[PDB]
A paper describes a structure:
Our structural studies identified D46, Q48, R143, N208, D210, and D213, all conserved across species, as key residues for subunit association or GTP hydrolysis. Mutations D46A, R143Q, N208L, D210N, and D213N all suppress SaFtsZ assembly as monitored by light scattering and polymer sedimentation, supporting a prominent role in filament formation. In accordance, the crystal structures of mutants D46A and D210N exhibit altered configurations at Region D. In the D46A mutant, bottom residue Q48 shifts 3 Å away from the K+ site, while the whole top T7 loop is distorted, underscoring the relevance of D46 in the connection between the top and bottom subunits in the vicinity of Mg2+. The relevance of this crosstalk area is highlighted by mutational analysis showing that D46A, N208L, D210N, and D213N, all impair filament formation in solution. In agreement, the structures of mutants D46A and D210N exhibit an altered configuration around this area.
Numbering used by the authors: 10 to 315
C-alpha cells in the first residue's frame, strides 16, 4: 500500500533531465520518456518510452512549434494513459519555449490529473539570450501548465547564470537545475516510506499540493551548531526558483535527524519558515528520527498557497 511515483520527461530538456536523474540513481520511481524526436528517444535511459507525432514529424522534432507538440500528444493520449496507469503522483518535467515541451507537456499533465494523480510540473523558462519570441512561447506554455497541474515549479534558466563562475561546465549547471526535481522527488519518496515520530503520509502531500498553483520545493542539510536554522534557511532560499517562499500560505515541512533532534531546534527551523513566508502559514509538520544520522539534520520544505 505504498504510493507510486513517476517522472515524465517531455521533449528534449525533459528527456535530458530524466537521463541525468537515472544516471544519478533514483530508486522506487518509474521514469517515462515522451518525445517527437526518435533519435533522442532511442538514446533515452527510461524504462518506458513513448514516441508521439510520428505521422506528424516523421520522427524528427516539432522544430520549436508548440502546436505540433500539442497535436502529437493529444493523438497519443491512450499510450500516455497506459504509461501513467498505476501512478499516485506524477512529475512532468520539460523545458518551455520549444515545440514539444511547450505543447505536449500540458497535455501530459492534464492526462495525469484526470487519472487522479497528484500532478506536479517542474519546467524551465528559456535564457534571455534565446530571444523574446522563445520567452513568449515559454510563457504561454507556463500558463498552460498551470491550468493542467496541481502545482507548478518554474526554473528560469537565467538563474543558472547566477550560480556559475566563468568556467562552470554547462552540464554541471544543468545538474543544479535537475536537483530541484530530483531532491523534491526524493524528499517526498522518503517522507512516504519512513514512518516518522510526528508522522506525515502521502495524504498530507496531497493536502499541500492538490490544486494549488505555484509551488516551492526545497531541501537543506546541515550539521554543527545552529544546524536546524541553517538547514531550514537552505531549504527555502534556492537562487534558481521563480517562486520564492514569500507569501507562501501552505507549507509541508519535515525534519529528519538523529536521536539528538531537540524540540527547541525543531521550533527554530519552523519559525524560520513561518517568518520568511511573512504570512501566517498553514504548516503540516513532521519529524523523522533516523539514528544512522549523527549530527546531520535534513529539512524538507514544500510550499504552496501563493
Ligand atoms: N535547464 C535546462 N534547460 C534546457 C535543457 N535542454 C533544453 N533546455 C531549455 O528548454 C527549452 C526547450 O528546448 P527543448 O526541450 O530541446 O525543446 P523541445 O524538445 O522542442 O520541446 C530550450 O529553449 C532551453 O531553454 C536542459 O537540459 N536543461
Ligand atoms: K510516513
Amino acid at each position: 500500500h505504498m504510493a507510486t511515483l513517476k517522472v515524465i520527461g517531455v521533449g528534449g530538456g525533459g528527456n535530458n533531465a530524466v537521463n541525468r536523474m537515472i544516471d544519478h540513481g533514483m530508486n522506487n520511481v518509474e521514469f517515462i520518456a515522451i518525445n517527437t524526436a526518435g533519435q533522442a528517444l532511442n538514446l533515452s535511459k527510461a524504462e518506458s518510452k513513448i514516441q508521439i507525432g510520428e505521422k506528424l514529424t516523421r520522427g524528427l522534432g516539432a522544430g520549436a512549434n508548440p502546436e505540433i507538440g500539442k497535436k502529437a500528444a493529444e493523438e497519443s493520449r491512450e499510450q500516455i494513459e497506459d504509461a501513467i496507469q498505476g501512478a499516485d503522483m506524477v512529475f512532468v518535467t520539460s523545458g518551455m519555449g520549444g515545440g514539444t515541451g511547450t505543447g505536449a507537456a500540458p497535455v501530459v499533465a492534464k492526462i495525469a490529473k484526470e487519472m487522479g494523480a497528484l500532478t506536479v510540473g517542474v519546467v524551465t523558462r528559456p535564457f534571455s539570450f534565446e530571444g523574446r519570441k522563445r520567452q513568449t512561447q515559454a510563457a504561454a506554455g507556463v500558463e498552460a501548465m498551470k491550468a493542467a497541474v496541481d502545482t507548478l515549479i518554474v526554473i528560469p534558466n537565467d538563474r543558472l547564470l547566477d550560480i556559475v563562475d566563468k568556467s562552470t561546465p554547462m552540464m554541471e549547471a544543468f545538474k543544479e537545475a535537475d536537483n530541484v526535481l530530483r531532491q523534491g522527488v526524493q524528499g517526498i519518496s522518503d517522507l512516504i516510506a519512513v514512518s516518522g515520530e510526528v508522522n506525515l503520509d502521502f495524504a498530507d502531500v496531497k493536502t499541500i499540493m492538490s490544486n494549488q498553483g505555484s509551488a516551492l520545493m526545497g531541501i537543506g542539510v546541515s550539521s554543527g551548531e545552529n544546524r536546524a536554522v541553517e538547514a531550514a534557511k537552505k531549504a527555502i532560499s534556492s537562487p534558481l526558483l521563480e517562486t520564492s517562499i514569500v507569501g507562501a500560505q501552505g507549507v509541508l515541512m519535515n525534519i529528519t535527524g538523529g536521536e539528538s533532534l531537540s524540540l527547541f531546534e525543531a521550533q527554530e527551523a519552523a519559525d524560520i519558515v513561518q517568518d520568511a513566508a511573512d504570512e501566517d502559514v498553514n504548516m503540516i509538520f513532521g519529524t523523522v528520527i533516523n539514528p544512522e544520522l549523527q549530527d546531520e539534520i535534513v529539512v524538507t520544505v514544500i510550499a504552496t498557497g501563493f
